[PDB]
């Protein structure tokens with residue numbers, strides 16, 4: 001229960017919608033993508049402008065409310081909703097200005113990935129983002145952000161030119177390489193720790209149709225497939241991106257009915273470049289084993305962005321255990337294959353991704369993002385429906401992570417699960433963490449923004 | 459030049475951006491998708507809320523500025539920009555609230571399709587719209603709106619449940635089957651004639667993966683393909699959509715270099731339903747001639763929405779000629795095939811679409827959309843780059859339209875070119891045209907919204 005004059009003051013400054021536990025659209029506004037997170041915020045504040053976030057940030061500050069900030073609500077830690085505090089919901093701020101002469105896009109802090117790519121591709125432009133269209137932009141970009149364009153153009157933070165950000169004291173700041181450049185260093189990898197970002201500006205690149213391929217390998221050929229992949233990507237051009245999603249086979253018509261719901265290697269690849277070059281390049285790598293249900297297409301980039309994932313089903317409940325690898329040993333290959341063979345839910349994926357390329361040529365200390373030079377990412381992403389099966393699906397992800405343990409180092413802040421608050425120092429490393437603390441003490445000394453992979457101040 | 463006091467009164471109420479002919483955002487804010495129209499407005503008002511629209515409408519009224527409304531800027535007639543007046547520019551009003559429980563979407567008047575179907579596909583939901591993702595939702599819906607889901611679920615207006623609309627006197631209204639139902643009839647097919655729809659509400663349907671195929675046929679086999687298409691669609695189930703676009707083959711690696719830049723039939727089809735049923739159904743319609751550059755895939759609906767068109771090139775300049783057909787005789791099939799062989803630009807398409815289905819089971823008088831009972835639509839959509847070549851490409855579409863004339867009737871308002879103001883009555887028919895003037899006399903008696911397929915009051 002809140003001081004009547006202070007809410008009266010907040011709401012006086014707010015143009016958006018307030019949702020209270022007793023209102024209609026409360027239960028749905030407070031659900032987030034990770035259905036295992038069931039929290040009841042004291043107030044959801046769906047902001048509609050930079051001034052509204054200013055109002056919300058200050059209200060929460062002297063009311064003492066715990067502050068959750070919501071972009072697209074895809075936090076695998078469930079950070080975008082709180083019990084008993086305030087949700088600063090940016091989901092209605094999803095505008096995107098795109099300048100065709102500038103190759104520039106100014107996007108609001110609540111954009112969904114697909115809204116951004118729709119607007120940029122109106123001029124055949126694009127910049128790197130994640131692969132699932134309904135991910136929010138805010139949480140992905142603030143943690144680094146990678147997808148199909150990353151090997152050629154870098155992380156999302158590698159194409160960020162500025163932010164407009166609301167700091168914990170209510171102020172509005174511009175952060176670029178020429179304005180508040182400590183802050184601009186922290187936001188490019190340091191999550192929500194330093195204020196609410198209400199507008200990202202990106203440099204955009206011209207991306208026409210990309211030649212794309214998706215196929216399925218039996219586990220029989222599991223070794224030959226993954227060893228071919230790790231060897232090829234060691235020397236592959238930036239233009240080739242190639243990923244492995246180990247999963248139960250989706251019951252799609254392009255695959256024989258006999259493999260349906262059997263573990264497979266789903267391999268997806270594309271070529272950011274001339275599709276004829278992609279046609280030869282992709283087929284050079286498509287046949288490490290016998291490809292089942294081969295799909296080959298020249299897609300607009302926006303269609304590439306909307307393709308993931310085969311079967312297009314939205315899981316209710318989630319658990320992710322992820323890490324980086326400097327090299328994928330044949331013993332690490334045998335253990336990913338033995339754990340894949342025991343996947344139970346039809347929505348679970350053991351993803352093996354190769355980064356590197358443009359991401360690894362950016363100097364390490366340029367941004368807050370860690371482990372640029374570790375080129376493998378592995379994500380044991382459990383995803384199911386039935387709440388009574390929670391234990392066994394998280395047990396699957398826990399035990400795949402443990403059996404890989406020492407091969408793994410660091411960690412992507414945006415793949416952390418709710419029980420991994422203590423991974424923050426080891427994900428960044430002592431050096432980056434300790435500089436991030438220096439920025440935290442300066443811009444958020446009270447730690448008003450602590451629902452995130454949080455860096456305490458000092 | 460305008461009144462300092464009411465300018466100041468408008469500025470005071472307006473929370474958006476203003477763009478003057480001296481502002482750095484002017485040249486690009488005033489360009490729309492049809493490059494052929496070059497118009498310099500006195501003021502571009504980039505609204506951010508409904509009261510913002512209330513202020514820009516009243517200001518134009520008091521000052522007598524000709525009002526253009528812009529949603530997505532895709533007006534084939536050029537209606538979203540004006541010389542010397544004010545643009546009410548909705549492109550920043552892009553937010554979409556999607557309720558999973560209700561299968562309901564609320565979309566602001568400036569949404570693009572790609573943001574809309576990103577928003578709904580986060581819950582495996584969808585409702586019909588166009589086939590190109592950067593088209594604005596506002597103008598498309600107010601004209602009816604058809605796309606991949608239309609034969610199964612009807613027009614975009616067949617799923618609209620209410621609109622929030624700002625009328626010429628500055629008042630804000632709700633129009634539905636329950637509230638001002640005369641107006642709710644008029645906006646469903648009558649364009650921007652009755653005010654600025656600041657919010658569209660829709661019923662959504664569950665649309666999982668959809669089996670999809672695109673392929674190309676030589677004009678050698680043009681006659682049998684198009685006859686099989688017209689014979690099959692007369693009997694096809696609603697779940698089968700099948701469209702033909704005659705064009706120059708794009709230089710894509712799936713096609714033999716021999717066909718690049720040569721006139722072909724690009725056939726695209728999909729099954730809204732079980733993909734295993736869909737594979738059998740698309741496969742039964744794929745071989746009326748030898749299919750080349752064949753792409754088959756099981757896509758998330760958002761990926762289907764993002765696919766058109768193969769090559770993904772945005773044309774600078776467009777001119778279109780379009781009409782309906784109750785029947786596609788062999789004399790017309792000939793005429794279509796011969797004019798397609800004369801296509802000179804690599805972005806020009808001769809579109810032959812089959813509607814019908816759920817579109818044609820809505821009683822004619824239920825909305826303002828005309829010609830549900832005509833299942834065929836053909837659109838000669840010339841699109842090029844060179845401004846010194848305008849006559850050539852405009853000539854191609856005029857003379858193709860006129861070589862079909864007697865087969866063509868009515869005309870989709872959303873496909874009219876800047877010279878076709880006269881076609882408003884033939885497109886609606888006399889009965890609908892007279893009923894719409896009746897509504898126009900009530901809600902826009904001064905014809906303040908006249909930059910549309912305009913319906914004069916009385």
Ligand SMILES: Cc1cc2nc3c(=O)[nH]c(=O)nc-3n(C[C@H](O)[C@H](O)[C@H](O)COP(=O)(O)OP(=O)(O)OC[C@H]3O[C@@H](n4cnc5c(N)ncnc54)[C@H](O)[C@@H]3O)c2cc1C
Nearest residue numbers: 071072073074075080109130131136138139140146192197
């Ligand atoms: C299905 C799925 C696919 C994914 N694919 C990819 C992928 O391809 N690549 C990749 O790199 N990651 C990917 N991710 C991870 C994604 O980057 C993170 O989950 C991200 O944090 C989600 O962003 P969000 O704002 O939508 O989530 P939220 O839960 O709304 O926010 C996450 C965190 O960011 C903070 N935050 C969000 N917006 C702002 C803002 N505007 N200002 C300040 N702080 C903010 C929140 O406070 C919170 O701590 C994926 C996640 C999912 C669930």
Ligand SMILES: Cc1cc2nc3c(=O)[nH]c(=O)nc-3n(C[C@H](O)[C@H](O)[C@H](O)COP(=O)(O)OP(=O)(O)OC[C@H]3O[C@@H](n4cnc5c(N)ncnc54)[C@H](O)[C@@H]3O)c2cc1C
Nearest residue numbers: 527529530531533538567588589594596597598604650655
């Ligand atoms: C590449 C392309 C693909 C297309 N594909 C399809 C398709 O598959 N199916 C189909 O049916 N049509 C299709 N169209 C046509 C489309 O429906 C129309 O061009 C439509 O006008 C697009 O709306 P818009 O808001 O983007 O256009 P705008 O230029 O922004 O607006 C067009 C008209 O609508 C009015 N208007 C716009 N928004 C509002 C509003 N909120 N309130 C009141 N009036 C408003 C404007 O004043 C103007 O009169 C396509 C067009 C293009 C260019």
